[PDB]
Amino acid sequence: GVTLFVALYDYEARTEDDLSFHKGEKFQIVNNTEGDWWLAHSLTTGETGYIPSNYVAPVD
């Protein structure tokens, strides 16, 4: 299977390159090898964009 990630806190993006999200929202990771911001797909909005890795945690 896969490991999803969960938002720990709300976040309001400043650029449309980044997702805005709310605590508890779940994401599939598209790419998390290029840096501290991860390209992700929200299972709530269906949008794809960057998320800050310090705002999420893996499902556990």
């Binding site: 976040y11 390159d17 790419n31 290029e34 840096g35 501290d36 911001w37 890795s53 310090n54």
Partner: peptide, 12 residues
């Protein structure tokens, strides 16, 4: 710096 490598936001 590319989008992946920007500074992270502070924790809330």
């Amino acid at each position: 710096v590319s989008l992946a490598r920007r500074p992270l936001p502070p924790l809330p």
